[PDB]
Design a binder for these strands. Structure first.
Ligand SMILES: [Zn+2]
Ligand SMILES: [Zn+2]
Lengths: 101, 142, 140, 81, 128
RNA sequence: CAUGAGUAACUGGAGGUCAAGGCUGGUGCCAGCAUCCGCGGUAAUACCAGCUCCAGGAGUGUCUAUGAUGAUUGCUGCGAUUAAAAGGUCCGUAGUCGAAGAACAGUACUUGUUUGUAAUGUGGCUUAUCGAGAGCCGAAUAGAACGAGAAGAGUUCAGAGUAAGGAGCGAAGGAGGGCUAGAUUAUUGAGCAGCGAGAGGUGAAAUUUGAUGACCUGCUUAGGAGUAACAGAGGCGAAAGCGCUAGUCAAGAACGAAUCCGAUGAUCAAGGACGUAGGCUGGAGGAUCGAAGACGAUUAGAGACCGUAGUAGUUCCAGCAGUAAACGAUGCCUACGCUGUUGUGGUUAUGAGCACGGCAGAAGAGAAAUCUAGUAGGGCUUUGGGGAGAGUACGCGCGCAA
RNA sequence: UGAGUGCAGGGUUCUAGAUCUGAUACAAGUCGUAACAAGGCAGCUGUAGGAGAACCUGUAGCUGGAUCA
């Protein structure tokens, strides 16, 4: 029986879409189906900022950040616990997740 | 719906309820009739005659003054073309597509458009060669 | 096909549909005259050539008593079942027996006997029911 | 019958599409435009498919667009039909 | 294009189910007029106005509380006077009430008038 | 009419369907019974018998064809989202189906009168003791002759111009298509320079490569693919499919509006054109990835999964081929239909509309799950009829083969 | 006008045949364990190689998936 109204993907009014590759296992997954995750990570760890304050030559310094978008296939997303199995009424709830660091 | 594609557009223009006589205008009957026959001899299609009469001379639908239709007036004056103007515009588009494909042979989309266009020609031809408006052995310019 | 002047189209279509029915198909396109008892005849005469036994299908546990018959009208050899309690004892090799159908729509196996399609009715011109129950005797 | 169904209010008329009514409505009309300066009058159609220039002075009086045409900044008009 | 007599029937059947009292019907022919005029004679509909719009035509009608259902038959079968009672028993709910309408050389008539005038015709539609 | 007298029932059943016994004795998965479901392994209301009951009765059981059962052949009257079942997409002939207004004609259509039926059958009455039986009466099918009526169907017309179609005009929008000329990085390969011991790969390791200087960091170059992030329940295309920037060449969709022609139209056997990927025939080329083949590990064994390496292919031009879970598993035109919200492109009395969408309820519907599935004798094509064998055999048509 | 009968062929229906190759039933024999749980490498459709055997591997697709995010 049909488990989801949208077939588990975001394609509508189209024939075909570009593929992308999974970060964890390099499998091909369609772009409109892949699980997506955003990361904004400081170059320097929080446990070093108190040393940075005496190491730097400049009057003040702003740490550089690094930015990423990651893609996962279903198997990897479930195994890494980005997503979890949910009850028949919970399946319908849609909410934006946090940006990781 | 549309004949060669999946279209369902609805853009048309409303025909009036009654037609009267355009008393606001600034020419006589005989002047309007002269304007038409001049534009005809210069070689304009009858749909363009209609556009000019509305736009420049200020007459809607070009019949309220004349009690006669544009193509019938051209037959009374003897200015009738050799081929009906619709069938004529279909042969032109075919020629254009064949002239493109002659130099850009690789275009599968243009090939597709040609076979649609060609079908429409013969469907129109069979109408006119039943109403005796074309000779029975007429064939396309190709 | 539902138009007022559509009768010809409708007739030809509906005729072609009927071949999907197994019943109509067999009568039309199968070999309906291959059988000793069937479309051809209600009963068949034949001569006994061997005595035989067969296991019942699961979950039953029995040996069923059967006879090899040469059919006079076709020259095929067929298996038949012998119905009654001591019935096998009423038949000798080279006796003549008359044979009968099991009562299904096509020729099909009945109950727990695998692959046997007929049963014995009379031996040497007399009813097997009378022979077994000792109401009458062999012609001798 | 209902009055609402046989005789719609003028509010209802104005909200509907020009074809989807008890009687279909003409939207195009004719006007007399007068030129700034030379004060000559030209007959024009609303929704014009052609750009139009004033008699005599040759100022472009009316510009054709995808919908209702645009009268040049200084000019003025009256509906005639 | 849809059949005009079919369109008439679905338009009034749905509006009746939705408990509306009046409707506008958008494409009208000669037999559609005569059908509506029949329903008025037997008191199934109350008021009729016709709009002369120069684009086909349209009608505005008031429904009564007595109308349960109506329908057109397609195609329009030919019937002898011997045949009409067969169709009567197939279409109508009771022997006591309701109308089966037939076209004839004497206009539209009901299954009782067929006996009076001694004429078959072609089957058109029904209401009860 | 008159004499004797006192004779005269069987077939199939008794666990359920299905009317009528847990009765007594044998037998112990044996022997048998049972259309179907099922009984019997020592406590059998089902076998073999006794005894009582049941059903029909001068009759009752069995086998075999057929009609019904059966809306499981569907004109009346079934189905095709998931149970069996909508052709991968278009074009198109035969075929079936086709506006409003005003008029006209009678061959179908319906009906009158007259013909057209011995027996059988149908409605009756009369005589054999009764009842079939016999005898007499009346009306009748299809088919044909001559009249009548004109709603529907048909033919014509133009001081008529579809929320029917085609031609054309105006301003604009889009990863729709072909061609020409350019581009920022990245992955490999070579040259040269610096440095002097490990690099790679994994869950953990070994094959493997390095003092002929690896790895990493510079500068030079040579190629062949690709267009990250922006990027979405966004857009375009008949479907398959389409994502860097300029220039160029044809045609199409939608919108605005007093342009022109007038039935030109819907659906479609046969016939024709397109169709991801993998494959095949010839040419160009060859970075990355990698069927086959070869090793290293793991295991009872791995021929596999993992790692090292490696060929055909993967790219382009000219063609052949014709299949996909080619799926929203929902044919194409055309209707009638509740509300709220959010998009994309035009137009706007700024109130709204038109085309193409998404989402959330409701009411109905349905075996439910759910809703492209509500209402319905609108038109046309494809298609299913319990599992298997079988989408297989033989014949035929296409293809170089597959 | 022609019966009968020569000699070649065809069209139909049956039947023989060394040997090979399908299917079905095999109480329970031998070797593994491919599917159904994330079935121990998620499964399935097309196409192409390979292999005691279920099957395995490349390439494009689908969710009837283990994700309506
Ligand atoms: Zn992965
Ligand atoms: Zn001026």
């Amino acid at each position: 029986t049909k488990k989801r109204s949208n077939n588990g993907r975001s394609k509508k009014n189209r024939g075909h879409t570009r593929c992308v590759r999974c970060e964890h296992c390099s499998a091909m997954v369609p772009n409109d189906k892949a699980i997506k995750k955003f990361v904004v990570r400081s170059v320097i760890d929080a446990a070093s900022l108190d040393d940075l304050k005496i190491a730097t030559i400049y009057e003040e310094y702003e740490v550089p950040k690094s930015y990423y978008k990651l893609n996962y296939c279903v198997s990897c997303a479930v195994h890494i616990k980005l997503v979890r199995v949910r009850s028949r009424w919970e399946r319908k709830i849609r909410k934006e997740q946090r940006v990781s660091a | 719906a549309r004949m060669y594609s999946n279209g369902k557009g609805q853009s048309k223009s409303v025909t009036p309820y009654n037609l009267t006589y355009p008393t606001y205008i600034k020419h006589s009957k005989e002047e309007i009739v002269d304007v038409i026959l001049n534009l005809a001899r210069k070689g304009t299609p009858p749909s363009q005659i209609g556009n000019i009469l509305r736009d420049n001379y200020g007459v809607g639908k070009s019949f309220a003054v004349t009690k006669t239709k544009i193509l019938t007036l051209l037959k009374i004056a003897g200015l009738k073309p050799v081929i009906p103007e619709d069938l004529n515009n279909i042969v032109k588009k075919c020629v254009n597509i064949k002239a493109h494909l002659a130099k850009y042979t690789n275009d599968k989309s243009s090939k597709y458009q040609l076979i649609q266009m060609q079908s429409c020609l013969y469907r129109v031809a069979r109408y006119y060669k039943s109403k005796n408006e074309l000779p029975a052995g007429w064939k396309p310019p190709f | 096909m539902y138009g007022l002047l559509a009768a010809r189209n409708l007739k030809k279509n509906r005729h072609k549909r009927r071949y999907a029915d197994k019943d109509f198909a067999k009568k039309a396109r199968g070999d309906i005259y291959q059988n000793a008892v069937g479309y051809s005849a209600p009963h068949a005469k034949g001569i006994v050539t061997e005595k035989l036994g067969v296991e019942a299908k699961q979950p039953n546990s029995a040996i069923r008593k059967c006879v090899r018959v040469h059919i006079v009208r076709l020259n095929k050899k067929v298996i038949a079942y012998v119905p009654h309690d001591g019935g096998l004892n009423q038949i000798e090799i080279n006796d003549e027996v008359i044979v009968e159908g099991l009562g299904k729509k096509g020729c099909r196996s009945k109950g727990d006997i695998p692959g046997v399609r007929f049963r014995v009715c009379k031996v040497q011109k007399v009813s097997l029911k009378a022979l077994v129950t000792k109401k009458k005797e062999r012609p001798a | 019958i209902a009055k609402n169904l046989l005789y719609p209010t003028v509010e209802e008329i104005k909200k509907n599409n020009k074809r989807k009514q008890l009687f279909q409505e003409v939207k195009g009309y004719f006007m007399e435009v007068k030129c700034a300066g030379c004060a000559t009058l030209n007959v024009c159609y609303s929704h014009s498919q052609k750009t139009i220039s004033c008699k005599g002075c040759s100022m472009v009086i009316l510009r054709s667009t995808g919908g209702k045409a645009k009268i040049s900044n200084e000019c003025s008009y009256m509906v005639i039909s | 294009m849809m059949d005009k007599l079919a369109n008439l029937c679905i338009t009034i059947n749905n509006a009746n189910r939705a408990q509306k009292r009046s409707v506008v019907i958008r494409r009208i022919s000669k037999v559609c007029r005569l059908f509506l005029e029949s329903m008025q004679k037997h008191g199934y509909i109350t008021d009729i106005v016709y709009i002369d719009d120069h684009r086909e035509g349209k009608a505005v009608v008031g429904l009564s509380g007595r109308l349960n259902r109506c329908g057109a038959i397609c195609p329009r079968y030919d019937v002898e006077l011997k045949d009409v009672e067969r169709y009567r028993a197939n279409l109508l709910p009771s022997r006591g009430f309701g109308h089966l309408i037939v076209t004839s050389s004497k206009g539209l008539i009901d299954h009782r008038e067929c006996i009076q005038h001694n004429t078959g015709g072609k089957i058109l539609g029904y209401f009860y």
